Amino acid sequence: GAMGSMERASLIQKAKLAEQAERYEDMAAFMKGAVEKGEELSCEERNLLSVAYKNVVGGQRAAWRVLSSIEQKSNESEEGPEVREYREKVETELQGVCDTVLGLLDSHLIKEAGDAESRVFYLKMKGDYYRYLAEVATGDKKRIIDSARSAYQEAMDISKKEMPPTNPIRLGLALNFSVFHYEIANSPEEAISLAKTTFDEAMADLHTLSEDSYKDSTLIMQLLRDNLTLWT
């Protein structure tokens, strides 16, 4: 790896600089290098890893959507192969990023994660990047969807046993599993039920929280509420 000669701490320091500079491809390469040093990741380092790849894949998804829409309109008008070719190029790059993240989780972040906060974070991530693969998949599709579902479900079982209902990781997991149900799995009733029960149980636990934790949890709860407003 091209980061094999750089110190772990220097890679983390440069990841933080790339974030300030909005250089997210660099940020992801630095954090991949950090993971490949073989030590477990702290809470802050896990969030750097997630921020970097979420921004990289987020730009790819936005581009694939523009191009797929142009491609679909062309098949309703006048006629060549360029639109399909360039959508395939972007799609292939997107899948490579997803495969890179899933490879880091499998070698060996997940198997070394013993605490609930790290294990749930990484299993959620696995579900997320199989979900991004599913958005562009065309049968194959079914195995990818089941891999996302399986990772989210394992994360959910742990989080319900081990975390309070207002925990931001538990909330973000439930939010994203509900989006999976609505957008990927054709199960809008399951999406709605999960979002409502997640929101209601967090509401009833807010009284236990400090002012800072209260702000953290209610921020994510608002996203559950926004989705419910769109879905109903």
Partner: peptide
């Protein structure tokens, strides 16, 4: 309109 997923 697309559903909102978790923020950073």
């Amino acid at each position: 309109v697309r559903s909102l997923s978790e923020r950073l």
